[PDB]
Design a binder for this molecule. Structure first.
Ligand SMILES: CC(=O)N[C@@H]1[C@@H](O[C@@H]2O[C@@H](C)[C@@H](O)[C@@H](O)[C@@H]2O)[C@H](O[C@@H]2O[C@H](CO)[C@H](O)[C@H](O)[C@H]2O[C@@H]2O[C@@H](C)[C@@H](O)[C@@H](O)[C@@H]2O)[C@@H](CO)O[C@H]1O
Ligand SMILES: [Ca+2]
Length: 136
């Protein structure tokens, strides 16, 4: 029941495989079954990454990242979540080793940012996200 400022914002990612376009992580659908059409998928890049562009700077609090759930859930491990300002200067970064459940929640404590990037640190692994939600 809070405004998800990432919903329907422009997205990009390192590449696309299996028609897993990056907008699937901001489609309002948390379903993690890749066959549902809700989940992104890159090729096995060096490294794989995904990003949302808020279009303007905003003050970011909670970021909630929902994993793929039907298969290959371990791929979302050893990754950074990085905030960038309007000139793509790095303003904050958190590292996530792995998920114990279907999602992870990170609190960036009001940091001003335009872009939120999720980046695997292990190359040669596709990045698949069910949904990334971003709150003020
Ligand atoms: C259109 C089509 O047939 N799609 C296939 C993928 O198969 C479908 O998606 C899977 C996730 C399963 O639900 C499957 O039952 C369904 O048909 C196929 O994925 C692989 O499917 C095999 C079974 O045939 C295994 O389940 C394997 O784990 C699946 O691969 C994982 O999911 C993929 C989407 C990629 O992320 C892979 O890297 C994973 O290992 C793929 C790959 O053969 O091919 C599509 O064309
Ligand atoms: Ca989705």
């Amino acid at each position: 029941g809070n405004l998800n400022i990432a919903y329907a914002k422009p997205t990009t990612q390192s590449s696309v495989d299996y028609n897993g376009d990056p907008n699937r992580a901001v489609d309002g659908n948390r379903n993690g079954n890749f066959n549902s059409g809700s989940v992104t998928h890159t090729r096995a890049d060096n490294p794989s990454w995904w990003e949302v562009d808020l279009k303007k700077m905003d003050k970011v609090g909670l970021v909630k990242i929902y994993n793929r759930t039907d298969a290959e859930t371990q791929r979302l491990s050893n990754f950074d979540v990085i905030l960038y300002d309007n000139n793509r200067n790095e303003v904050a970064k958190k590292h996530v080793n792995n998920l114990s459940g279907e999602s992870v929640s990170l609190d960036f404590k009001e940091k001003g940012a335009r872009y939120i990037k999720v980046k695997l640190l292990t190359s040669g692994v596709p990045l698949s996200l069910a949904e990334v939600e971003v709150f003020r």
